[PDB]
Design an enzyme around this catalytic site. Structure first.
Site, PDB file in Angstrom:
ATOM      1  N   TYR A  17       3.935  24.723  12.943  1.00  0.00           N
ATOM      2  CA  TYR A  17       4.786  24.628  11.721  1.00  0.00           C
ATOM      3  C   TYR A  17       3.182  24.834  10.942  1.00  0.00           C
ATOM      4  O   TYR A  17       1.915  24.321  10.657  1.00  0.00           O
ATOM      5  CB  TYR A  17       4.730  23.317  11.179  1.00  0.00           C
ATOM      6  CG  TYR A  17       6.266  22.314  11.441  1.00  0.00           C
ATOM      7  CD1 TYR A  17       7.569  23.039  11.179  1.00  0.00           C
ATOM      8  CD2 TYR A  17       6.473  21.401  12.774  1.00  0.00           C
ATOM      9  CE1 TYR A  17       8.555  22.777  11.395  1.00  0.00           C
ATOM     10  CE2 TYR A  17       7.555  20.953  13.032  1.00  0.00           C
ATOM     11  CZ  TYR A  17       8.720  22.287  12.633  1.00  0.00           C
ATOM     12  OH  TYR A  17      10.146  21.255  13.444  1.00  0.00           O
TER      13      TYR A  17
ATOM     14  N   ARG B  77      -2.294  18.025  22.268  1.00  0.00           N
ATOM     15  CA  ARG B  77      -3.211  18.683  21.940  1.00  0.00           C
ATOM     16  C   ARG B  77      -4.441  19.045  22.766  1.00  0.00           C
ATOM     17  O   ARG B  77      -4.009  18.303  23.156  1.00  0.00           O
ATOM     18  CB  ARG B  77      -4.153  17.795  20.657  1.00  0.00           C
ATOM     19  CG  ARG B  77      -4.775  19.417  20.362  1.00  0.00           C
ATOM     20  CD  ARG B  77      -4.711  18.244  18.530  1.00  0.00           C
ATOM     21  NE  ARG B  77      -5.752  19.451  17.657  1.00  0.00           N
ATOM     22  CZ  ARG B  77      -6.727  19.406  16.669  1.00  0.00           C
ATOM     23  NH1 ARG B  77      -6.321  18.469  16.071  1.00  0.00           N
ATOM     24  NH2 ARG B  77      -7.000  20.552  16.176  1.00  0.00           N
TER      25      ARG B  77
ATOM     26  N   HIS C 142      -0.627   9.487  19.671  1.00  0.00           N
ATOM     27  CA  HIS C 142      -0.524   8.472  19.503  1.00  0.00           C
ATOM     28  C   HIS C 142      -0.472   6.881  19.380  1.00  0.00           C
ATOM     29  O   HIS C 142      -1.219   5.760  19.118  1.00  0.00           O
ATOM     30  CB  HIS C 142       0.697   8.416  17.233  1.00  0.00           C
ATOM     31  CG  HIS C 142       0.668   9.974  16.919  1.00  0.00           C
ATOM     32  ND1 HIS C 142       2.112   9.379  16.124  1.00  0.00           N
ATOM     33  CD2 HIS C 142      -0.291  10.828  16.773  1.00  0.00           C
ATOM     34  CE1 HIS C 142       1.999  10.952  15.488  1.00  0.00           C
ATOM     35  NE2 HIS C 142       0.623  11.604  15.910  1.00  0.00           N
TER      36      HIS C 142
ATOM     37  N   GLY D  14       5.096  18.120  18.508  1.00  0.00           N
ATOM     38  CA  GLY D  14       3.727  18.002  17.840  1.00  0.00           C
ATOM     39  C   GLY D  14       2.714  17.493  18.512  1.00  0.00           C
ATOM     40  O   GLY D  14       1.741  16.499  17.460  1.00  0.00           O
TER      41      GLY D  14
ATOM     42  N   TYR E  56       0.911  -1.245  -0.425  1.00  0.00           N
ATOM     43  CA  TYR E  56      -0.027  -0.505  -0.149  1.00  0.00           C
ATOM     44  C   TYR E  56       0.669   1.152  -0.518  1.00  0.00           C
ATOM     45  O   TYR E  56       0.520   2.023   0.246  1.00  0.00           O
ATOM     46  CB  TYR E  56      -0.679  -0.206   1.090  1.00  0.00           C
ATOM     47  CG  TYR E  56      -1.499  -1.640   1.301  1.00  0.00           C
ATOM     48  CD1 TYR E  56      -1.259  -2.451   3.113  1.00  0.00           C
ATOM     49  CD2 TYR E  56      -2.684  -1.952   0.523  1.00  0.00           C
ATOM     50  CE1 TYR E  56      -2.167  -3.561   2.705  1.00  0.00           C
ATOM     51  CE2 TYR E  56      -2.336  -2.722   1.165  1.00  0.00           C
ATOM     52  CZ  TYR E  56      -2.370  -3.936   1.865  1.00  0.00           C
ATOM     53  OH  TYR E  56      -3.173  -5.075   2.405  1.00  0.00           O
TER      54      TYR E  56
END
EC number: 2.1.1.20
Lengths: 283, 284, 283, 285
Positions: free
Chosen positions: D194, D175, D142, D137, D21
């Site tokens: 960014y 976040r 995650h 970040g 993929y």
């Protein structure tokens, strides 16, 4: 390079071999959950029989037949019953029972057929309509909103409502998803239609997409070790469903809501497990 | 990190909604194929009738019911028939037909039930046994060899044979897989039992594992300028190997004969049969 | 009703978490198989070095770089090397080694880049062409015929051949798939390029579609307790491949076939494990 | 009867053919998103630089390298930088950038390696420890809670904290998931590190299990040569209170903790609602 290959296409079968996943752990434990219905509550029976006798109904259509448990009672009580389900797996149990009892004339005249809510107009001969159409056991909530606009919900309801003769009755329920949403928990054994004789631990997953509830998934575990299976449901809120169900008749109906078989008044103290909508077709 | 959420477990159903992939295109075109049985060949009818009457069979067990069409003809002709299958999706059509014809007496007495070759001894009470056990249409080949040692095939057959009364018949067939393996091709529409009304293009895929034939997979295509398809797999039983297996199931205690498309098969004959039918009479 | 939902799309990654299936049994046992290359055969080396020196080649392109083992030798023997692969997973090992040896000027000079045989014209600057292009280790056979007409096989070969300068050399091999087809068995440890220092039991599956060989799948079982992985191959016969590789140069080439590094004469007694085609571009 | 035949095992590759993929449409649009890092905000540069120089940090460990962009800026500004990640697919872009710049001395001395938070103690020799450990970040989110008990989160944090020298820094962010859970929405293009050059429509899906937030899954639709393509990623929605507890526990209480909201001090009940919370820990020592 990354393609996979099947022994056989999804959906097909062959003589001498079990159908796809028919003998798996999940399917086996699920067969016990749907078989856990030989204790219908006295309260459920009385209420539904009372309702149909009160309105003088004779020809009843059951549009979520499943294994046939609601329909079977009605057959025994002398109604003229047509039972219809989209799922052949479940319908198999209803047909089986009819066969075992085919020598009792009441069961000989019991009509059982495949139909889908979304094509019900074509699937079922309704004539002038049935005296009562039933959709109990929180079955409507099995129809998800794949399209995202609840358009499949509206079509199913319109088609189901169109089976009801003028002055006839639609009885249709859903579970109290208002409660489930606000607590995140879907407690086990709260089926007021049938007393569970089978112990359950249930994990409850709620999915909200762009701030609107979309799906409730229950994961059922049973003791053995212990094994599990999963089913999913669309969480209809009372206010939304009330609007949807009346829209289905194009506003031409009398509507009332019961909570666990008793009149419901918003902001009443008792929080019911189930809401049952009763609709008289006004034309 | 890489797991997937289902809506509902595999194999599970729910009121109001169609079962998994039951409305798929593959399943639709496959339905047409299982349905292609309107024209029973007169040769097949005459042959089986003859065979059974010859041996005085009344109590007959069909262990590969499918849609019931093999069994239905025996009901009509006045036999006492017990039909079983492992497959509910096919059994459905047998049951349905029996329901539609339930006012005919023979139909009322037709017994149709769920049963698996691998547990047949348990799923079906044989009492003393049946006069004739039938497993026709190449159905036996649908059971693959998941284990490598063909032990399931042997257990299956053994269970199938134990349903035959002493001095009873087992009639069991298979497509000619010697020809298919030899040529690499499974030509379409050669069903000797039911003349095909439906046209199909087949693609024949043969898997060989460590130089032993393991599977034949056929992809069937049909029209309606349409082009939908579906797929089934089979176990390619050669004549010699199956002859050995079916005998061993009886423990050698039988008379074995093999027919090729209803007529006696003499090895080295010019005619190459589409099907081999094994006719066993249990000693007794 | 039957749809599934992912945590993440196929193909994507995220900081702090292992990539998809990168830490699974199959991946781990396969990492051992591709690492099983620290015993390059003396016979391989001498032949290839011998060939390139004999033809006076300096700039070589290796179009099936993988982990870089063939290229690394060529770097160490003073060729100017460009190494290219379509697989980043394997390329990671070649880049790694370069980095570790970056302070040796030869390795500093080594060029390593992603490219795909089907877009090689665009992916690799070739100028007038390379002196020699290599594709060894039975790598070509990794490209299956998904389209059914071998059109991808021809395109890949035409692009690979177009990297070769006029008078230049293409060296490209395949395993003896004539033998494997007729016996159904793909014996383990027969790699004449690298001596396996790792025991593997192999199951061999051959798929034939409408009477034409289509795929060979090897299922490798490796103790370290058994873990399995699976790779697949297109089984190129000598006669077909000889035709395909010459077509690739539009006929304008000298062609010869080696069997395990020695001249091959059809019907000779010795059945080789590998055929190596050597092509000189005649224009 | 129902089993499936693969061409090759999952996770396995082969010379000459692209990995699984890798050329898919979802992977291609996802590459654009991870690539959207050409405009480092001046506020971010200035903030981190300041913070580190303030605590006299030279040896710095980036435990969420990704494409390298956080680390690259530190290489340029003369720090001694060790960057790791569990993800090869992303690490590839970090390595590639180091290769391209290998003639600059700083990039020759840039260390980039594979390592997992869950085995970090083993994948990286910390010696005595690093002066500052960074994990910025929103990368920590995650890691999902596969087990229910948040144990992996705890192990991970503990491992991350063990890389910090006595008296060194951990700087780690997330976040603002209080706002996302509260509103049900994850608004696009608020990256404070960014500035986004790429436009996206996001669909925000929140899963709650037995009434505890378990997963936030964002589907991004991104425009193409005018067409639309989608990719998905999932995240663990760490609220401020819970993460503040978790990150302290990782040190065993033996730290000074402060929380920033979009680079400025955070005072609970302030009018401004941050997009990111940045936890700054100084290990006692």
């Amino acid at each position: 390079v990354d393609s996979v290959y099947r022994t056989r296409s999804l959906g097909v079968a062959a003589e001498g071999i079990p159908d796809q996943y028919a003998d798996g752990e999940a399917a086996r434990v699920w067969q016990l959950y749907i078989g856990d219905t030989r204790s219908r509550t006295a309260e459920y029976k009385a209420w539904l029989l009372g309702l149909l006798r009160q309105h003088g109904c004779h020809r009843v259509l059951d549009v979520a037949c499943g294994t046939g448990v609601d329909s079977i009672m009605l057959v025994e009580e002398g109604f003229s019953v047509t039972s219809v389900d989209a799922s052949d797996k479940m319908l198999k149990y209803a047909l089986k029972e009819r066969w075992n009892r085919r020598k009792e004339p009441a069961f000989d005249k019991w009509v059982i057929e495949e139909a889908n809510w979304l094509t019900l107009d074509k699937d079922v001969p309704a004539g002038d309509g049935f005296d009562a159409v039933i959709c109990l056991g929180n079955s409507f909530a099995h129809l998800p909103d794949s399209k995202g606009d609840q358009s499949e919900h509206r079509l199913a309801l319109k088609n189901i409502a169109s089976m009801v003769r003028p002055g006839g009755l639609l009885v249709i329920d859903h579970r109290n998803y208002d409660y489930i949403l606000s607590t995140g928990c879907a407690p086990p054994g709260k089926n007021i239609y049938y007393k569970s004789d089978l112990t359950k631990d249930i994990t409850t997953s709620v999915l909200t997409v762009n701030n609107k509830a979309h799906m409730v998934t229950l994961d059922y575990t049973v003791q053995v070790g212990f094994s599990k299976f999963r089913l999913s449901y669309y969480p209809h809120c009372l206010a939304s469903f009330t609007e949807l169900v009346q829209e289905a008749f194009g506003g031409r109906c009398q509507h009332s809501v019961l909570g666990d078989f008793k009149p419901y008044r918003p902001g009443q103290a008792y929080v019911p497990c189930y809401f049952i909508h009763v609709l008289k077709k006004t034309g």
